[PDB]
Amino acid sequence: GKEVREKLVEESTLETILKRGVLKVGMSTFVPWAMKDKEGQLIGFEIDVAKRLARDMGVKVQFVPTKWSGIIPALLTGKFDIIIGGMSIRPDRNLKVNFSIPYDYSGMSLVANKKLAQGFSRLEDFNKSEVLIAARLGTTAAKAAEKYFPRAQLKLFDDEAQAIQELLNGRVHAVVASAPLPAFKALEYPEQLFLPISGTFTKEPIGFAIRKGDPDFLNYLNSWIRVVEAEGWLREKHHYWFETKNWEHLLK
Template sequence: MKTFKFVKSMVVAAAIAVTSLSASTAPVQAQGLIEEIAQRGRIRVGLSTFVPWAMRDRNGELIGFEVDVARQLAEDMGVEVEFVPTAWGGIVPALLANRFDVIIGGLSITPGRNMTINFTRPYAHSGQQMAANIELAGEFTSLDDYNSTSVTLVCRRGATSCDYISQRFPRATLRQFDDEAQAYQEVANGNAHAIISSAPKPAFYTADHPDTIFMANGGDNLTSGNEGFGLRKGDPDALNFFSNWILYRTSDGWLQERHDYWFRDQSAWIDQIAAD
C-alpha cells in the first residue's frame, strides 16, 4: 500500500511539473481582433462608395446598405464605428496593411480573393448587370455582339465585373476606372458601348437616363454572386463572430429589410444623395 501511494504521488508530481513547464514555455496567444475592437471601443470599416451600397448624402455623410450594416454591427458590439473610405482597387491591400479591421463593401466572394483574405458567410446576394448606350449598341441582338474588337466596355477597377468582361468578351476593348461615376459617364457620352457592374446600379442609371441608356440582356443579370465581410487570415474567432452576427441578423429579418430598402426602389432615398 505504501509503495502504491509513493508511485501515485510521484505521478501527480510529475504531471504538475510538466504542466508548469508547458505553461511557462508556451507562447503567449496574440490578442484577437474582437478583443482588440472591444478594448479600442471602435471598429474600423473599409468601404468604397458605390450606389446603393455606400454613398454620400447632400451633407457629405455616408449612407447606404453597407453603412447601415456597419452601424448596426457596431451597435450590437457595443462600440463606435469608424469608416475608412478606400479606392476599390486597393481595398484588399489596405485590409492586409491593417488600415482597417474589416471590409464591409459589397465584396464578392471569389476563389482568387479567398486565397488572400477570409470571407464570412454571405450577407447579401447580387449579380452583374449591363447598361449600354442606345446609339452605339441599340441594334445589338445578343451578348455575342459585344464580343468584338470594335466594342469598348468599361468597369470599376478591381471589381469582379472586370474579370467577367475579360472572360466573356475577350475581343472587346476593356477600360477600367477608379471612379465608377466616370465609367458610367463614358457610356452616357458615347465613348463606350456599355458598362457592367453590380446590380442594381445599372438599372437605376438606366432609369435616370432613358434617352441614352438601355438595359442589355433584357434587363436580366449576367451573373449571380454572394457578398461577404473580408477579414485578414489567421483569426478564426473573428471569422466565427462576424459570420454568426450575419446569421443572427439574417434570422431576425433585419438584413433582408435593409437590403430591400436600398435595392428594390431608389425613390425612398434618391433625394438624399448628392448629385453625380
C-alpha cells in the first residue's frame, strides 16, 4: 500500500548525494559566472551558489568542469548530480532535464569593434548580410544572434576568450553575450571596443538542471533558493560578481 511511493523517495538523486557525502556539480567557464583564478581554484557567482548549497546540505562539493555544448549529455549519463552553470531555463532543454525555480536572471548584450562597426548605434545595424557576429557555442547567446540578427554571418566558438580575441583583432563586428560581459569588455579595451547600446535585449531566468522523475530533489532545491533569496544573499552575490570588478585581481 506504500511501496511505489517509498521507492521513489529512495531513488531520488538527493539520496544519492547524501549517501556519497559529496555534491557533484557540472559547470563551464564563463567570466564571472565560473572561472579558474591565479591560485588554480574555481571562483565565480555559480561557484559561490554551489558551495553554499553543498554546505547547507551538509556535504562536500566536487566540481566537474565540462564542455558547455556537452553539459546536458554529461548530466544525463551521470557525470555529476546537478548543473549549476548559469543555465537559462529553456523549453528545448526541458525536454531532457528538469529545472529549478530561478535563482538568477540575465539578459543579452552586444559589444562591437570600433573600426568595423563605426557608426553602428542600433540593434538593426548589425542585422545585415555583411556583418560578422561571434557568440559562444551552444548558448542562448547563439540563439539570440540567430533571432535578432538573422541576416548576419554567425561564427561560433567553444571558448569565451577566443571569441573576444576575434573581436579585439578586428575579425568580427560584434560579440553577442550575456551582460555584464559586453559592458565589462568595452570598459577593459576602449582602444578597440565600444558598447553600441546600454541595457539588455533578452530577459532569461536561470535555474539548476537535474535529471527527471525527482520531485524530492526539486523540492529541496526550490526551498533552498527561496530561503537564500529572502536572506538577501543571492542579491549580494549577484551585485558582487556582476555589478563590481572587486574580484578582478584574483584572475591571471
